[PDB]
Amino acid sequence: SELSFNYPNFQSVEDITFQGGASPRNETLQLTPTDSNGIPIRQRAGHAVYSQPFQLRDTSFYTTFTFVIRTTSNSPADGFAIFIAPPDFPVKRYGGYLGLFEPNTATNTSANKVVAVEFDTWVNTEWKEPRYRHIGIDVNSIVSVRVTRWQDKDVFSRSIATAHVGYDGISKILTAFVTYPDGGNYVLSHVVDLAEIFPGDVRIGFSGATGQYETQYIHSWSFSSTSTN
């Protein structure tokens, strides 16, 4: 279906739903909470989602957002993701599950209905993933289907970074481009039929989780979808 929205900053959160530990702070979406001294709270997850559902049948889409990861140590955890899921999709487990999965079913593709691009600051040995920080595409599992190294220089830059995520509904390809100013650029593409996974309604949004020594902030976000008929 056709849907467009645009938040050049989050001085407005008019259409945004906040769940779990996520909140509007400093004209951004703050995905996980901080205490009254500004310290990241461990073992929390939160979602900030566009409130209105849409459909993916015969649809392409483009979305872009800017974000900052603020770390207070060289061992931050756990990262955040942009995700698509059904509209009743709740905030799930904190830690390495990134608020997107339940421990009992995290790697079971038949038990999950969620597609995400993840920015993973913490190397987990509880399931298969790279030995370094990484950006990944996730289809129904915490074990990414396509993954690439995320350079520490970019991770710790404190820069406002940009992501572009698009879906070509004809070729059934999900793509992410991630860029840092005067820094690294990242490209991941993966063939996945989103309409098959999601034959009804979906909502798009962000999920972050701790972990430790890390807060994740979205600073802007826009989106457009169009019919491929």
Added chain:
Amino acid sequence: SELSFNYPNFQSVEDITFQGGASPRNETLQLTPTDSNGIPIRQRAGHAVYSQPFQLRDTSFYTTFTFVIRTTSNSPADGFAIFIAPPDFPVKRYGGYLGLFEPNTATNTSANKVVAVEFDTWVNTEWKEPRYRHIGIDVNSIVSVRVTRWQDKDVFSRSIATAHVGYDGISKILTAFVTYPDGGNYVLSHVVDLAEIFPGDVRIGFSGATGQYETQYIHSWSFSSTSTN
């Protein structure tokens, strides 16, 4: 192989190779020439290409540029493309061939070695293309393999638009995202093994052609390529 470059504008055109009717103008790359009255010169093609060749084996890349199409009537032609080809690729035919193909072989995939994302302002009936203006991915042929409608409101906007083109060397997928400020967004992705098409060196750059009543300008451009080992 690994190559990066960055032109925040074209105050300098050092390491750009120009051919045909393309030249440096007012801190831009002007793809096709204008006459002493400022009027687009009909039936001209030009290339502006980065000078340093690179290799595609086990390589991913990201490129972005901004551009303007200047039309002087409601019947502009022909458009421009970003393209990859061997480094001795010459300027080819003007008009709907976009500077990229010769008439006798333009639709014969075995007779060409060029891949492009094209911005096509002129619907040609001399071969198969859509009945409206369109953005396309071309693989060895002027008949695009993937095409999407390009809205006339964007075409004629006179805005500074942005393109992002990426290649995922693991999945072998070329993707374009094109964006207009308060305008349309476009997404195309296609599977193509660029290292198989181009076993040796290649350059990346632009090709524009007239046509009539149109000049194409590139205002900024950056590129990075990284190994997939």
